[PDB]
Structure 1
């Protein structure tokens, strides 16, 4: 069974960028529900119930048709949010090989940011914006609802290894920014954990 992972910091650790109230609800309510629903579906699937969540979402096709969707949505939700919590932190700075790779594939850090913001703002409805690594090259893509590029193009419409991502479901920014998703996206640059992003870039898996 999966369990709600504890945050790598306190609920108010991202103030004044991300509000304390949302962090709490987003974690203890939204993420908790994904964990609970994923467990309920896995009770009758012992073979898959033991796989790490990041691995299970790469094998959605091997699941019985009546379970494919519920797990895509909930296991996907669990995987995405787990990665999201670890990708947030104040006080880090973009540098090293990651910074070099970004300037190489996007021209500059500013071009990259503009590209990411555009993808995040243009995702209509619920979804995520990602910075992924594919073919030794970095790219910006977005997915719908709780889909992840780890699921493959056939399923999510995107592919690649997630380096970092931004949750653009309205629950992630409505209490503080309401309809102003653009302001939320800009505030994100202040809390993106570049150390974790660099770490994932180094691992490549």
Structure 2
């Protein structure tokens, strides 16, 4: 069975950038609900129920017809939130190989930040903005709802290995930012975990 993962930090660990109350609600309510609903849909599927969630979301076309949507949505939700928590941490710096690769692929760090900000702001409705590794090249993409680039292009409209991501569902920013998503996107730069991003970049897979 999937479980709600413990966070790598206290709920207030991202203050003053991301608010404590939201972190707690977002974790214990929204993420928990994806875990529960994914588990319910997987009970009848022993051949899928016990795989890692990040594996399952590469396999959606393997499922029975009637399970594809519910697991896209809920295994997507579990995978994405699991990545998100580990992809946040204060006191990191974009540097080393990852910084150089970003400069290579976008021309500069500021070009990459602007492209990411634009993608995050222009995702209408619910979704996620991502930095992905697509073949040799880093890229900025967005997905709808709980879709992940790991699901591939035909399902998610994006592809590549996620390096990091920003949740732009309203629940992620309502309490502190209300409708001001650009303000929330700016605060993300203060809490994106560049150490984990670098680790993921190094691994490539």
Same fold? TM cut 0.5? yes
Shift of 1:149: 0.2
Per-residue CA deviations over 1:125-179 (Å, capped at 9, x if unaligned) read 0000000001210000000000000000010000000000000000000000001
How many residue pairs get aligned? The number is 205
Alignment partner of 1:202: what SS?
Answer: helix
Which structure 1 segments of 5+ residues have no match? none
**Distance (Å, rounded) in 1 between the aligned partners of 2:91 and 2:57:** 32
1:137 aligns with 2:124: no
Query: RMSD of the TM alignment (CA)?
Result: 0.4
1:59-90 Cα offsets, whole Å, 9 max, x none, are: 10110111110000000000000000000011
Per the TM alignment, residue 50 of structure 1 is displaced from its structure 2 partner at its CA by 1.5
**TM-aligned CA deviation for residue 7 of structure 1:** 0.3
Mapped partners of 1:182, 1:35: distance in 2? 29
Report the counterpart of residue 21 of structure 2 in structure 1: 21
TM-score, length-scaled by structure 1? 0.99
- Runs of 4+ aligned structure 1 residues displaced above 2 Å come to none
TM-score, reference length from structure 2:
0.99
How far apart in 2 are the matches of 1:134 and 1:14?
29
